[PDB]
Amino acid sequence: MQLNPESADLRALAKHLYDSYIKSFPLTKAKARAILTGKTSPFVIYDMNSLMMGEDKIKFKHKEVAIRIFQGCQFRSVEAVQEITEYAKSIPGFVNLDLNDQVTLLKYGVHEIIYTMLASLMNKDGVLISEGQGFMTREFLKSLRKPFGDFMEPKFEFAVKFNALELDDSDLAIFIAVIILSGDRPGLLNVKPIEDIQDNLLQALELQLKLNHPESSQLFAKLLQKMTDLRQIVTEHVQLLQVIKKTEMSLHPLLQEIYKDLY
Ligand SMILES: Cc1oc(-c2ccccc2)nc1CCOc1cccc(Cc2nn(-c3ccccc3)nc2CC(=O)O)c1
């Protein structure tokens, strides 16, 4: 690499995305990791008893336990779509795209971003819930009645391998922008303007990674592969949502909208 006006713009892009990311997402990976390691204290949900006690202790913003959990994830999920929408709008050039492509991008992109960021809140033992007020265990989740015990496990599997990459918020800010700016979403009007934004974002990501991670040369290439993996996770998940919606089925109507064309 070289220091030129082009690289300097790539760094300013990265700073700008990082600053928006801090504005849009109140629970950052930095914050989540400090909660997780204990240097900063969440109520842990590890069994049916602690689940009930935690519902008492945790002031939630938003009837059988697996359904209650499903609803919590649905409301968390719609809150995430608002945050991700606010962030997308800060991606330079995004608001100048046709409003229809903006929504198409967000529609096909939000779950990939959701699972990416979910990894930030996970370790091998569990996941942060309710802005870090609670911690729900991987095995408590695996123990929920068929078929709810299989929803979260692939997210945990993805997350332990993803978290071993040791990305930080600065890396993630650009990673997430690349994902939002995918010119290959169905029903896109003007693909070329999107592809131009992404190639630039991609340059900014590759520079950021080289600078921020001297211990690995393979990181950019592994990240590209992670984006493909995320599409599988969303795919696997919507199907699991199909072969379950045949037994209950309150699905949030905003989520219903997003899922229908994902189906
Ligand atoms: C594991 C968990 O639980 C809670 C929580 C509980 C009570 C109150 C408040 C929060 N927060 C988290 C942490 C964020 O997880 C999320 C966040 C976004 C999307 C999903 C996928 C999903 N996963 N499920 C699901 C259903 C039942 C069991 C396990 C998972 N539903 C969905 C919804 C969707 O598919 O759209 C999970």
Q: Which structural traits does this protein have?
A:
263 residues; mainly alpha; Retinoid X Receptor; 11 helices; globular; binds ligand ZAA; transcription; ligand-binding domain; transcription factor; Activator; Disease mutation
Question: Brief overview, please?
Answer:
With 263 residues, this protein is mainly α. The chain contains eleven helices and three strands. The protein has a single domain, classed as Orthogonal Bundle (Retinoid X Receptor), CATH 1.10.565.10.
Mind explaining what this structure looks like?
The chain has about 260 residues and is mostly helical. It has one domain: Retinoid X Receptor (Orthogonal Bundle). The chain is built from eleven helices and three strands; from the N terminus they run ααβαααββαααααα. A three-stranded mixed beta sheet has the order 1-3-2. A hairpin with a 4-residue loop joins strand 2 and strand 3. Helix 1 crosses helix 9 and helix 7 packs antiparallel against helix 10. The longest helix has 24 residues. The protein is globular and about 60 Å long. The chain binds the ligand Cc1oc(-c2ccccc2)nc1CCOc1cccc(Cc2nn(-c3ccccc3)nc2CC(=O)O)c1. The site of the ligand Cc1oc(-c2ccccc2)nc1CCOc1cccc(Cc2nn(-c3ccccc3)nc2CC(=O)O)c1 has 22 residues, from helix 4, helix 5 and strand 2.
